[PDB]
Write a protein that binds this ligand. Structure first.
Ligand SMILES: [Zn+2]
Ligand SMILES: [Zn+2]
Length: 59
DNA sequence: TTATTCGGAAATTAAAAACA
DNA sequence: GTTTTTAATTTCCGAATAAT
C-alpha cells in the first residue's frame, strides 16, 4: 500500500513568524522554522473572544 | 528550482447555554 | 457546581506567485 499523508498534530501554539507565514510551527523554542530562517522566535498573545454576546438557544 | 505569500479548510477553544 | 454547544479564533495545507 502507498503511504497516506499523516496530518501532523498541531503545535501547542505558533510563534509570530510561523503565524505571519501561515506555516507549521512546533513546540520547540526557538521553533525549527526560525532556526533554519535565522529569525527571532517570539510568542505573541492570542485574542480573547468577548463576553456578553448572546447566541440564542442551542439545538 | 526554491522562497514567499495567502485563501480558506480544518482544528482549537472558551462564553453561552444546558445540565446536575 | 458539573458539561455541552458551537462561533470566534488559530493553525497550517496546499496552491499560487515571486525570487533566484
Ligand atoms: Zn514557529
Ligand atoms: Zn519560531
Amino acid at each position: 500500500s502507498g503511504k497516506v499523508k499523516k496530518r501532523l498534530p498541531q503545535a501547542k501554539r505558533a510563534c509570530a513568524k510561523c503565524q505571519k507565514d501561515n506555516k507549521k510551527c512546533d513546540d520547540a523554542r526557538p521553533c525549527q522554522r526560525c532556526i533554519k530562517a535565522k529569525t527571532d522566535c517570539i510568542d505573541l498573545p492570542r485574542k480573547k473572544r468577548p463576553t456578553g454576546v448572546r447566541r440564542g438557544p442551542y439545538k
